[PDB]
């Protein structure tokens, strides 16, 4: 099967700043992956991104009730859907599991299964944070509404100094600490 | 602070389409085109919200008719294939005889057609496997997750085999220990 | 609550 493929894409995007205080709306049409026509809440009308969408922008702007509908989309569509799922999306908090194990000139701190993805992980030498030789795997999205991240520490495991991994997450009112 | 995206697509000649909502990179729900049902990514979401799936079927039908129109405008220029980046990992640190899940992550690909198969010791495994629908991206390619819940053993060896038209031979990502 | 869909518009012919 080598016959050509043809893809149409439509993305109705809602962008929120400080919750529903500042909202931007984008009605975007795509041929394969190129945007050819777009309505921007800041612009107020459909505009052709490429000449491929030139016929649609002039046609859609002329339709009766179109602009009144699309210009109200921030209140009627973006702000509405925000509150429909605010309780289990914006307000979703899952506290994380923190696991510490060596793998040994490298000690690793594994933080798993938290939401949202905003997290801060530090490494304390003993009572002062080691800010050198620390590498992080970054924020990895598990795809099941949970996140995980791995911070490594290229330190010399010397018996008798305690090592503490400290994570900070919006799900907790106080930092979480785990000692080796 | 947050971004909610209603993402739709229709693909020819496969005659395949999907309709999903995305919140900060995660799926809220998608509409099963065959069953004409709303399918929530997390089962708990269905208790606090609802969605009339008939509106999605109407939107997919408009995208199908628009695709024929848009294909004419471009004088029948097809999509250019883009191969995927496949990554296999584990949502928890692996421990012997302690249940866990393997995550095959397919990223940065188009068109949204893939053959993904889990391989335990070179032999296909289909018991317990789950999969996500095609998820959008800012560059307007696609991404997808495949999950194989497994029990870690020192004997077993796992593989994720992905077939795409941007590749030649299948891409096979390994995992052991 | 009840989710809501921005409808798809028919392109000009």
């Amino acid at each position, epitope marked *: 099967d080598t016959r050509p493929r043809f893809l149409e894409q439509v993305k109705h995007e809602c962008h929120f700043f400080n919750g529903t205080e500042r909202v931007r709306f984008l009605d975007r049409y795509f041929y394969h992956q190129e945007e050819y026509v777009r309505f921007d809440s800041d612009v107020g009308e459909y505009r052709a991104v490429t000449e491929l969408g030139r016929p649609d922008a002039e*046609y859609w702007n*002329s*339709q*009766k*009730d*179109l602009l009144e*509908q699309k210009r*109200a989309a921030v*209140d*009627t569509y973006c702000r*509405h859907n925000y509150g429909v799922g605010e309780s289990f999306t914006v307000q979703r908090r899952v506290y994380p599991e923190v696991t510490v194990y060596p793998a040994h000139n490298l000690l690793v701190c594994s933080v798993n299964g938290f939401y949202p993805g905003s997290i801060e992980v530090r490494w304390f030498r003993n009572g002062q944070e080691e800010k050198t030789g620390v590498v992080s795997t970054g924020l990895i999205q598990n795809g099941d509404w949970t996140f995980q991240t791995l911070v490594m520490l290229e330190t010399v495991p010397r018996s008798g100094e305690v090592y503490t991994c400290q994570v900070e997450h919006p799900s907790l009112t106080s930092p979480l600490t785990v000692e080796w | 602070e947050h971004v909610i995206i209603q993402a739709e697509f229709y693909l020819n000649p496969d005659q395949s389409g999907e309709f999903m909502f995305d919140f900060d990179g995660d799926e809220i729900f998608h509409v099963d085109m065959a069953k004409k049902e709303t399918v929530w990514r997390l089962e708990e979401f269905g208790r606090f919200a609802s969605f*009339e799936a*008939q*509106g999605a079927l*109407a939107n997919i*039908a*408009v995208d199908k*008719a628009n695709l024929e129109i848009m294909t004419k405008r471009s004088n029948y220029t097809p999509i250019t294939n883009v191969p995927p980046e496949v990554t296999v990992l584990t949502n928890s640190p692996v421990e012997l005889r302690e249940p866990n899940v393997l995550i095959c992550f397919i990223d940065k690909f188009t068109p949204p057609v893939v053959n993904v198969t889990w391989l335990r010791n070179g032999k296909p495994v289909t018991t317990g496997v789950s999969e996500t629908v095609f998820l959008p991206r800012e560059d307007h390619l696609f991404r997808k997750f495949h999950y194989l819940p497994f029990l870690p053993s020192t004997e077993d060896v796992y593989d994720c085999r992905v077939e795409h038209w941007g590749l030649d031979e299948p891409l096979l990502k390994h995992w052991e220990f | 609550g*009840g*989710y*809501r*869909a*921005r*409808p*798809a*518009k*028919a392109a000009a012919t």
Partner: T-cell receptor
Framework: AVFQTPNYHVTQVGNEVSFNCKQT?????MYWYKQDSKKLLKIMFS???????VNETVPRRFSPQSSDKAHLNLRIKSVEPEDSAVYLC????????????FGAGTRLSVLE | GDSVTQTEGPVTLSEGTSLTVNCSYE??????LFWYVQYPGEGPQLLFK?????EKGSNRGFEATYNKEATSFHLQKASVQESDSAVYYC???????????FGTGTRLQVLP
């Protein structure tokens, strides 16, 4: 505007009747409504871009048709005396909540 | 399911009289409310619509308040003219899709 034909039509039970409607607003969605002497306004069919969305009518008696987004035609295979009413055509921007724009109406009289 | 109940029977007023067409609705979703007027010889026609819960609509001296707590959309005008003689329809539709439920229209006859 929304244009309907015919304006009036009288026929006998068991005959075939055909209604036609055109809207020039550029809208994607068109409707057929039945209005009776009691001034009750009930939907029969709704089309959005040549695809049927809503069907509230008796199964297998009617036959809507839409070759174009701006055209919506209705056909009654066999008219019963209860089909005597005013049939209104309407349009809306899309299938979402919108203003309905009606035509003048077709007055049908079905006689034994 | 979705229901709309408005004033029954013909209403006959002398010009200058205050009009009140009661409209009560019953819906499980969050709707937008409409008033439609049908002048003699024409089809129905949008008077005004209120999308959000506790706002007010107005047109041609008519006015109605979307009363979410009372589930009412009562139409009122302080001084009806002879040109207001028509049939008035109170309509409901959910905000997620266009499924418009009309009430039994109230015929208003304004006498000089």
């Amino acid at each position: 505007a929304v244009f309907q034909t015919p304006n009036y039509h009288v026929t006998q039970v068991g005959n075939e009747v055909s209604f036609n409607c055109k809207q020039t607003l550029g809208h994607d969605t068109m409707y057929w409504y039945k209005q009776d002497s009691k001034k009750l306004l009930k939907i029969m069919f709704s089309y959005n871009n040549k695809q049927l969305i809503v069907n509230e009518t008796v199964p297998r008696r009617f036959s809507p048709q839409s070759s174009d987004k701006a055209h919506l035609n209705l056909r009654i295979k066999s008219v019963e005396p209860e089909d005597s009413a005013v049939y209104l055509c309407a349009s809306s921007l899309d299938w979402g909540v919108n203003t309905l724009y009606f035509g003048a109406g077709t007055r049908l009289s079905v006689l034994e | 399911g979705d229901s709309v109940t408005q004033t029954e029977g013909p209403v006959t007023l002398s010009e200058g009289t205050s009009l009140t067409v009661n409209c009560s609705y019953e819906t499980k979703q969050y709707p937008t409310l409409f008033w439609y007027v049908q002048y003699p010889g024409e089809g129905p026609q949008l008077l005004f619509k209120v999308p959000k819960a506790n706002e007010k609509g107005s047109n041609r001296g008519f006015e109605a308040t979307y009363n979410k707590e009372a589930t009412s959309f009562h139409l009122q005008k302080a001084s009806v003219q002879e040109s207001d003689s028509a049939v008035y329809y109170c309509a409901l539709s959910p905000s997620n899709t266009n499924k418009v439920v009309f009430g039994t229209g109230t015929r208003l006859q304004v006498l000089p």
